[PDB]
CSV table of N, CA, C and O and ligand atoms in Angstrom, one decimal:
chain,number,residue,atom,x,y,z
A,101,UNK,N,10.4,-20.4,-15.1
A,101,UNK,CA,9.5,-19.8,-14.3
A,101,UNK,C,9.2,-20.6,-12.6
A,101,UNK,O,8.7,-21.2,-12.8
A,102,UNK,N,9.0,-19.0,-11.9
A,102,UNK,CA,8.7,-19.8,-10.4
A,102,UNK,C,8.1,-18.9,-9.7
A,102,UNK,O,7.7,-19.2,-8.6
A,103,UNK,N,8.0,-17.7,-9.9
A,103,UNK,CA,6.8,-17.1,-9.4
A,103,UNK,C,6.0,-16.1,-10.1
A,103,UNK,O,6.4,-15.7,-11.7
A,104,UNK,N,5.1,-14.8,-9.6
A,104,UNK,CA,4.7,-13.8,-9.8
A,104,UNK,C,4.7,-13.0,-9.0
A,104,UNK,O,4.9,-13.2,-7.8
A,105,UNK,N,4.4,-11.3,-9.0
A,105,UNK,CA,4.8,-10.5,-8.2
A,105,UNK,C,3.2,-9.3,-8.9
A,105,UNK,O,3.1,-9.4,-10.1
A,106,UNK,N,2.2,-8.5,-8.0
A,106,UNK,CA,1.3,-8.2,-8.4
A,106,UNK,C,0.9,-6.9,-7.7
A,106,UNK,O,1.5,-7.0,-6.4
A,107,UNK,N,0.6,-5.5,-8.0
A,107,UNK,CA,-0.3,-4.6,-7.4
A,107,UNK,C,-0.1,-3.5,-7.8
A,107,UNK,O,-0.2,-4.0,-8.9
A,108,UNK,N,-0.1,-2.7,-7.1
A,108,UNK,CA,-0.2,-0.8,-7.6
A,108,UNK,C,1.4,-0.6,-8.1
A,108,UNK,O,1.5,-0.4,-9.6
A,109,UNK,N,2.1,0.1,-7.4
A,109,UNK,CA,3.3,0.7,-7.7
A,109,UNK,C,4.4,-0.5,-7.2
A,109,UNK,O,5.0,0.4,-8.0
A,110,UNK,N,4.1,-1.3,-6.6
A,110,UNK,CA,5.3,-2.3,-6.6
A,110,UNK,C,6.6,-1.5,-5.4
A,110,UNK,O,7.9,-2.0,-6.0
A,111,UNK,N,6.7,-0.5,-4.9
A,111,UNK,CA,7.4,0.7,-4.1
A,111,UNK,C,7.2,0.4,-2.7
A,111,UNK,O,7.5,1.6,-2.1
A,112,UNK,N,6.3,-0.5,-1.8
A,112,UNK,CA,6.3,-0.5,-0.7
A,112,UNK,C,5.4,0.3,0.1
A,112,UNK,O,4.1,-0.5,0.7
A,113,UNK,N,5.3,1.5,-0.8
A,113,UNK,CA,4.0,2.8,-0.3
A,113,UNK,C,2.6,2.2,-0.2
A,113,UNK,O,2.1,2.6,0.5
A,114,UNK,N,2.0,1.1,-1.0
A,114,UNK,CA,1.1,0.6,-0.8
A,114,UNK,C,1.4,-0.8,-1.0
A,114,UNK,O,2.1,-1.5,-1.7
A,115,UNK,N,0.1,-1.9,-0.8
A,115,UNK,CA,0.5,-3.3,-0.5
A,115,UNK,C,1.1,-3.8,-2.1
A,115,UNK,O,0.5,-3.4,-3.6
A,116,UNK,N,1.5,-5.3,-2.0
A,116,UNK,CA,2.0,-6.2,-2.8
A,116,UNK,C,1.6,-7.5,-2.9
A,116,UNK,O,1.6,-7.6,-1.4
A,117,UNK,N,1.3,-8.6,-3.8
A,117,UNK,CA,1.1,-9.4,-3.5
A,117,UNK,C,2.7,-10.5,-4.3
A,117,UNK,O,2.6,-10.1,-5.6
A,118,UNK,N,2.7,-11.2,-3.5
A,118,UNK,CA,3.9,-12.2,-4.6
A,118,UNK,C,3.8,-13.8,-4.0
A,118,UNK,O,2.9,-13.9,-3.1
A,119,UNK,N,3.7,-14.1,-5.3
A,119,UNK,CA,3.4,-15.9,-5.4
A,119,UNK,C,4.8,-16.8,-6.2
A,119,UNK,O,5.2,-16.1,-6.8
A,120,UNK,N,5.4,-17.3,-5.5
A,120,UNK,CA,6.5,-18.5,-5.5
A,120,UNK,C,6.1,-19.8,-5.5
A,120,UNK,O,5.8,-20.1,-4.2
A,121,UNK,N,6.4,-20.7,-6.3
A,121,UNK,CA,6.6,-22.0,-6.4
A,121,UNK,C,8.6,-22.3,-5.8
A,121,UNK,O,9.4,-22.3,-6.4
A,122,UNK,N,8.2,-22.8,-4.4
A,122,UNK,CA,9.2,-23.6,-3.7
A,122,UNK,C,9.8,-24.7,-3.6
A,122,UNK,O,9.6,-25.5,-3.4
A,123,UNK,N,10.2,-24.8,-5.2
A,123,UNK,CA,10.5,-26.1,-5.8
A,123,UNK,C,9.2,-27.3,-5.7
A,123,UNK,O,8.0,-27.5,-6.4
A,124,UNK,N,8.7,-28.2,-4.2
A,124,UNK,CA,8.0,-28.9,-4.1
A,124,UNK,C,6.7,-27.9,-4.0
A,124,UNK,O,5.5,-28.2,-4.1
A,125,UNK,N,7.3,-26.8,-2.6
A,125,UNK,CA,5.8,-25.9,-2.2
A,125,UNK,C,5.3,-24.8,-2.6
A,125,UNK,O,6.4,-24.4,-4.2
A,126,UNK,N,4.3,-24.4,-2.5
A,126,UNK,CA,3.7,-22.9,-2.9
A,126,UNK,C,3.8,-22.2,-2.2
A,126,UNK,O,3.3,-22.4,-0.9
A,127,UNK,N,3.7,-20.6,-2.1
A,127,UNK,CA,4.1,-19.8,-1.0
A,127,UNK,C,3.0,-18.7,-1.5
A,127,UNK,O,3.6,-18.2,-3.0
A,128,UNK,N,2.1,-18.2,-0.9
A,128,UNK,CA,1.8,-16.5,-1.5
A,128,UNK,C,1.8,-15.6,-0.2
A,128,UNK,O,1.6,-16.4,1.4
A,129,UNK,N,2.2,-14.6,0.3
A,129,UNK,CA,2.4,-13.4,0.7
A,129,UNK,C,1.7,-12.2,0.5
A,129,UNK,O,1.7,-11.4,-1.1
A,130,UNK,N,1.0,-11.3,1.4
A,130,UNK,CA,0.7,-9.6,0.8
A,130,UNK,C,1.6,-9.1,1.7
A,130,UNK,O,1.0,-9.1,3.1
A,131,UNK,N,2.3,-7.9,0.9
A,131,UNK,CA,3.1,-6.9,2.1
A,131,UNK,C,3.2,-5.5,1.8
A,131,UNK,O,2.7,-5.7,0.5
A,132,UNK,N,3.8,-4.7,2.8
A,132,UNK,CA,4.5,-3.5,2.1
A,132,UNK,C,5.9,-3.8,1.5
A,132,UNK,O,6.8,-3.0,1.5
A,133,UNK,N,5.9,-4.6,0.4
A,133,UNK,CA,7.4,-5.1,-0.1
A,133,UNK,C,7.8,-4.3,-0.7
A,133,UNK,O,7.3,-3.4,-1.6
A,134,UNK,N,9.2,-4.0,-0.3
A,134,UNK,CA,10.2,-3.2,-1.5
A,134,UNK,C,11.0,-4.4,-2.4
A,134,UNK,O,11.9,-5.3,-1.5
A,135,UNK,N,10.7,-4.7,-3.5
A,135,UNK,CA,11.1,-5.6,-4.3
A,135,UNK,C,12.6,-4.7,-4.8
A,135,UNK,O,13.4,-3.6,-4.2
A,136,UNK,N,13.6,-5.7,-5.3
A,136,UNK,CA,15.1,-5.3,-6.0
A,136,UNK,C,14.3,-4.7,-7.2
A,136,UNK,O,13.6,-4.7,-7.7
A,137,UNK,N,15.4,-4.1,-7.9
A,137,UNK,CA,15.3,-3.4,-9.2
A,137,UNK,C,15.1,-4.3,-9.9
A,137,UNK,O,14.8,-4.1,-11.4
A,138,UNK,N,15.5,-5.7,-10.5
A,138,UNK,CA,15.8,-6.5,-11.3
A,138,UNK,C,15.5,-8.0,-11.2
A,138,UNK,O,16.2,-8.5,-10.3
A,139,UNK,N,14.0,-8.5,-10.5
A,139,UNK,CA,13.8,-9.1,-9.7
A,139,UNK,C,13.8,-10.9,-10.5
A,139,UNK,O,13.3,-11.1,-11.6
A,140,UNK,N,15.2,-11.6,-10.0
A,140,UNK,CA,14.8,-13.3,-10.0
A,140,UNK,C,15.2,-13.9,-9.4
A,140,UNK,O,15.8,-13.1,-8.0
A,141,UNK,N,15.4,-15.2,-9.1
A,141,UNK,CA,15.9,-16.2,-7.9
A,141,UNK,C,17.5,-16.9,-8.3
A,141,UNK,O,17.3,-17.1,-9.5
A,142,UNK,N,18.6,-16.3,-7.8
A,142,UNK,CA,19.8,-16.9,-8.3
A,142,UNK,C,20.0,-18.8,-7.5
A,142,UNK,O,19.5,-18.8,-6.3
A,143,UNK,N,19.9,-19.4,-8.5
A,143,UNK,CA,20.2,-21.2,-8.4
A,143,UNK,C,21.1,-21.3,-9.2
A,143,UNK,O,22.4,-21.5,-8.5
B,447,UNK,N,-8.9,11.1,26.5
B,447,UNK,CA,-9.0,10.4,24.8
B,447,UNK,C,-8.1,9.3,24.2
B,447,UNK,O,-6.9,9.8,24.7
B,448,UNK,N,-8.7,8.4,23.8
B,448,UNK,CA,-7.8,7.2,23.6
B,448,UNK,C,-7.7,7.5,21.8
B,448,UNK,O,-8.3,7.2,21.3
B,449,UNK,N,-6.4,7.8,21.0
B,449,UNK,CA,-5.9,8.1,19.8
B,449,UNK,C,-6.2,7.1,19.1
B,449,UNK,O,-5.9,7.1,17.9
B,450,UNK,N,-5.4,6.1,19.6
B,450,UNK,CA,-5.1,4.7,18.7
B,450,UNK,C,-6.2,4.7,17.9
B,450,UNK,O,-5.6,3.3,16.7
B,451,UNK,N,-7.3,4.6,17.7
B,451,UNK,CA,-8.4,4.0,17.0
B,451,UNK,C,-8.6,5.2,15.8
B,451,UNK,O,-8.7,6.6,16.0
B,452,UNK,N,-8.1,5.1,14.5
B,452,UNK,CA,-8.2,6.1,13.7
B,452,UNK,C,-9.1,5.7,12.1
B,452,UNK,O,-9.2,4.5,11.7
B,453,UNK,N,-9.3,6.3,11.2
B,453,UNK,CA,-10.6,6.4,10.4
B,453,UNK,C,-10.0,7.2,9.0
B,453,UNK,O,-8.6,8.4,9.4
B,454,UNK,N,-9.8,6.7,7.6
B,454,UNK,CA,-9.4,7.6,6.5
B,454,UNK,C,-10.3,9.0,6.3
B,454,UNK,O,-11.7,8.6,6.1
B,455,UNK,N,-10.0,10.2,5.9
B,455,UNK,CA,-11.0,11.3,5.8
B,455,UNK,C,-10.5,11.8,4.5
B,455,UNK,O,-11.7,12.2,3.6
B,456,UNK,N,-9.3,11.2,3.7
B,456,UNK,CA,-8.9,12.0,2.3
B,456,UNK,C,-8.7,10.3,1.5
B,456,UNK,O,-7.8,9.6,2.2
B,457,UNK,N,-9.0,10.3,0.2
B,457,UNK,CA,-8.6,9.4,-0.7
B,457,UNK,C,-8.9,10.2,-1.9
B,457,UNK,O,-9.9,10.8,-2.5
B,458,UNK,N,-8.3,10.0,-2.9
B,458,UNK,CA,-8.2,9.9,-4.5
B,458,UNK,C,-9.3,9.8,-5.2
B,458,UNK,O,-10.2,10.3,-5.7
B,459,UNK,N,-10.2,8.2,-5.0
B,459,UNK,CA,-11.1,7.7,-5.4
B,459,UNK,C,-11.3,6.8,-4.2
B,459,UNK,O,-11.2,6.4,-3.3
B,460,UNK,N,-12.9,6.5,-4.6
B,460,UNK,CA,-13.7,6.0,-3.6
B,460,UNK,C,-13.6,4.2,-4.1
B,460,UNK,O,-12.9,3.4,-4.7
B,461,UNK,N,-13.1,3.3,-2.6
B,461,UNK,CA,-12.6,2.1,-2.5
B,461,UNK,C,-14.2,1.1,-3.1
B,461,UNK,O,-15.3,1.5,-3.5
B,462,UNK,N,-13.7,-0.1,-4.0
B,462,UNK,CA,-14.5,-0.9,-4.3
B,462,UNK,C,-14.6,-1.7,-3.4
B,462,UNK,O,-13.7,-2.1,-2.3
B,463,UNK,N,-15.4,-2.7,-3.2
B,463,UNK,CA,-16.2,-3.9,-2.6
B,463,UNK,C,-15.0,-4.4,-1.9
B,463,UNK,O,-14.1,-5.0,-2.3
B,464,UNK,N,-14.6,-4.3,-0.6
B,464,UNK,CA,-13.3,-5.0,-0.1
B,464,UNK,C,-12.1,-4.6,-0.1
B,464,UNK,O,-11.1,-5.3,-0.2
B,465,UNK,N,-12.0,-3.5,-1.1
B,465,UNK,CA,-10.5,-3.1,-1.2
B,465,UNK,C,-10.0,-2.1,0.2
B,465,UNK,O,-10.6,-1.6,0.6
B,466,UNK,N,-8.9,-2.6,0.2
B,466,UNK,CA,-8.3,-2.8,1.5
B,466,UNK,C,-7.2,-1.8,1.5
B,466,UNK,O,-5.6,-2.4,2.2
B,467,UNK,N,-7.1,-0.9,1.2
B,467,UNK,CA,-6.1,0.7,1.0
B,467,UNK,C,-5.3,1.4,2.5
B,467,UNK,O,-5.7,1.8,2.8
B,468,UNK,N,-4.8,0.8,2.7
B,468,UNK,CA,-3.6,0.8,4.5
B,468,UNK,C,-2.9,1.7,3.7
B,468,UNK,O,-2.2,2.8,5.0
B,469,UNK,N,-2.5,2.3,2.9
B,469,UNK,CA,-1.2,3.4,2.7
B,469,UNK,C,-1.6,5.0,3.5
B,469,UNK,O,-2.9,5.4,3.5
B,470,UNK,N,-0.7,5.6,4.1
B,470,UNK,CA,-0.7,6.5,4.8
B,470,UNK,C,-0.2,7.7,4.1
B,470,UNK,O,0.2,8.4,5.1
B,471,UNK,N,0.6,7.4,2.9
B,471,UNK,CA,1.2,8.6,2.5
B,471,UNK,C,0.2,9.9,2.2
B,471,UNK,O,-1.0,10.1,2.0
B,472,UNK,N,0.9,10.9,2.1
B,472,UNK,CA,0.4,12.5,2.4
B,472,UNK,C,-0.1,12.6,1.0
B,472,UNK,O,0.2,12.7,-0.2
B,473,UNK,N,-1.5,13.2,1.1
B,473,UNK,CA,-2.4,13.4,0.0
B,473,UNK,C,-1.8,15.1,-0.8
B,473,UNK,O,-1.9,15.7,0.7
B,474,UNK,N,-2.8,14.7,-2.0
B,474,UNK,CA,-2.5,16.0,-2.2
B,474,UNK,C,-4.0,16.9,-3.0
B,474,UNK,O,-4.4,16.4,-3.4
B,475,UNK,N,-4.8,17.7,-2.1
B,475,UNK,CA,-5.8,18.3,-2.8
B,475,UNK,C,-5.6,19.3,-3.6
B,475,UNK,O,-6.8,19.6,-4.4
B,476,UNK,N,-4.4,20.1,-3.5
B,476,UNK,CA,-4.3,21.5,-4.2
B,476,UNK,C,-3.5,21.4,-5.3
B,476,UNK,O,-3.0,20.1,-6.5
B,477,UNK,N,-3.9,22.1,-6.6
B,477,UNK,CA,-3.2,22.3,-8.0
B,477,UNK,C,-1.8,22.2,-8.0
B,477,UNK,O,-1.0,22.3,-9.1
B,478,UNK,N,-0.7,22.5,-6.7
B,478,UNK,CA,0.3,22.8,-6.5
B,478,UNK,C,1.2,21.5,-5.7
B,478,UNK,O,0.2,21.0,-4.8
B,479,UNK,N,2.1,21.3,-6.2
B,479,UNK,CA,2.9,20.1,-5.8
B,479,UNK,C,3.1,20.0,-4.4
B,479,UNK,O,3.9,20.9,-4.1
B,480,UNK,N,2.6,18.7,-3.2
B,480,UNK,CA,3.1,19.1,-2.4
B,480,UNK,C,4.2,18.2,-1.7
B,480,UNK,O,4.4,18.2,-0.7
B,481,UNK,N,4.9,17.8,-2.6
B,481,UNK,CA,6.4,16.5,-2.6
B,481,UNK,C,6.2,15.9,-1.7
B,481,UNK,O,7.6,15.9,-0.5
B,482,UNK,N,5.3,14.8,-1.1
B,482,UNK,CA,5.0,14.7,0.5
B,482,UNK,C,5.5,15.5,1.8
B,482,UNK,O,5.9,14.4,2.7
B,483,UNK,N,5.0,16.6,1.8
B,483,UNK,CA,5.3,17.2,3.2
B,483,UNK,C,3.9,17.8,3.3
B,483,UNK,O,3.4,18.4,2.2
B,484,UNK,N,3.5,18.3,4.4
B,484,UNK,CA,2.2,18.1,4.9
B,484,UNK,C,2.2,20.0,4.9
B,484,UNK,O,3.0,20.8,4.8
B,485,UNK,N,1.0,20.3,4.7
B,485,UNK,CA,0.1,21.6,5.0
B,485,UNK,C,-1.2,21.7,4.3
B,485,UNK,O,-1.7,20.9,3.9
B,486,UNK,N,-1.7,23.0,4.8
B,486,UNK,CA,-3.1,23.0,4.0
B,486,UNK,C,-3.2,22.8,2.1
B,486,UNK,O,-1.9,22.7,1.5
B,487,UNK,N,-4.4,22.2,2.2
B,487,UNK,CA,-4.5,21.2,0.9
B,487,UNK,C,-3.5,19.9,0.4
B,487,UNK,O,-3.3,19.8,-0.8
B,488,UNK,N,-2.4,19.6,1.3
B,488,UNK,CA,-1.5,19.0,2.0
B,488,UNK,C,-1.7,17.9,2.6
B,488,UNK,O,-1.3,17.9,3.2
B,489,UNK,N,-2.7,17.4,3.0
B,489,UNK,CA,-2.9,16.8,4.1
B,489,UNK,C,-2.4,14.9,4.1
B,489,UNK,O,-2.4,14.3,3.6
B,490,UNK,N,-2.4,15.0,5.4
B,490,UNK,CA,-2.1,13.4,6.1
B,490,UNK,C,-3.5,12.7,6.0
B,490,UNK,O,-4.9,13.5,6.2
B,491,UNK,N,-3.6,11.8,5.0
B,491,UNK,CA,-5.4,10.9,4.9
B,491,UNK,C,-6.0,10.9,6.0
B,491,UNK,O,-7.1,10.5,6.0
B,492,UNK,N,-5.4,10.4,7.3
B,492,UNK,CA,-6.2,9.8,8.2
B,492,UNK,C,-6.2,10.9,9.8
B,492,UNK,O,-6.5,12.0,9.6
B,493,UNK,N,-7.6,10.3,10.4
B,493,UNK,CA,-7.6,11.7,11.5
B,493,UNK,C,-7.8,10.4,12.3
B,493,UNK,O,-8.2,9.3,13.0
B,494,UNK,N,-8.0,11.0,13.6
B,494,UNK,CA,-8.5,10.1,15.0
B,494,UNK,C,-9.4,10.5,15.8
B,494,UNK,O,-10.1,12.1,15.6
B,495,UNK,N,-10.3,9.6,16.5
B,495,UNK,CA,-11.5,9.6,17.2
B,495,UNK,C,-11.1,10.4,18.7
B,495,UNK,O,-12.0,10.8,18.9
B,496,UNK,N,-10.3,9.8,19.1
B,496,UNK,CA,-10.0,10.6,20.6
B,496,UNK,C,-11.0,9.9,21.5
B,496,UNK,O,-11.3,11.1,22.3
C,501,NAG,C1,11.1,-24.4,0.5
C,501,NAG,O1,11.2,-25.8,0.2
C,501,NAG,C2,12.2,-26.4,0.9
C,501,NAG,C3,12.3,-27.8,0.0
C,501,NAG,O2,13.5,-28.7,0.4
C,501,NAG,C4,11.4,-26.6,2.4
C,501,NAG,O3,12.4,-27.4,3.2
C,501,NAG,C5,11.2,-25.2,2.9
C,501,NAG,O4,10.6,-25.5,4.3
C,501,NAG,C6,10.7,-24.3,1.9
C,501,NAG,N1,9.9,-23.2,2.8
C,501,NAG,C7,9.3,-22.7,2.4
C,501,NAG,C8,8.8,-21.2,3.3
C,501,NAG,O5,7.7,-22.9,1.4
C,502,NAG,C1,-6.2,1.0,-7.6
C,502,NAG,O1,-5.1,1.6,-7.6
C,502,NAG,C2,-5.0,2.7,-8.2
C,502,NAG,C3,-3.7,3.3,-8.5
C,502,NAG,O2,-3.0,4.1,-9.1
C,502,NAG,C4,-5.9,3.9,-8.7
C,502,NAG,O3,-5.8,4.7,-9.3
C,502,NAG,C5,-7.6,3.1,-8.5
C,502,NAG,O4,-8.7,4.0,-8.5
C,502,NAG,C6,-7.9,2.0,-7.5
C,502,NAG,N1,-9.0,1.6,-7.2
C,502,NAG,C7,-10.1,1.6,-6.8
C,502,NAG,C8,-11.3,1.6,-6.6
C,502,NAG,O5,-9.7,3.0,-5.6
């Protein structure tokens, strides 16, 4: 487990919150995100 | 007129404290589906002070 997504619709038309543990770091963003249809990180 | 300053005139529900809804998507006031296209009872949600 390496992150979380939050929002209302999760389809860019209204804002969404992304939280990620980037190995050592932690990153937080609020954006008009369009996610991929099956979210995961390739490692 | 300076039209660059805008305010929301239409929303489905009232904001809670510091809720910051920026969405520009076309609103529906009517019982008939507006399908994301402008018209009577199918309003653009913002307005300009000019
Ligand atoms: C992500 O983590 C790597 C770890 O080496 C770091 O170099 C990079 O600057 C980080 N980037 C962000 C946006 O956190
Ligand atoms: C928060 O967003 C949802 C999106 O469906 C909406 O139903 C709800 O009324 C919103 N909350 C407020 C206080 O407007």
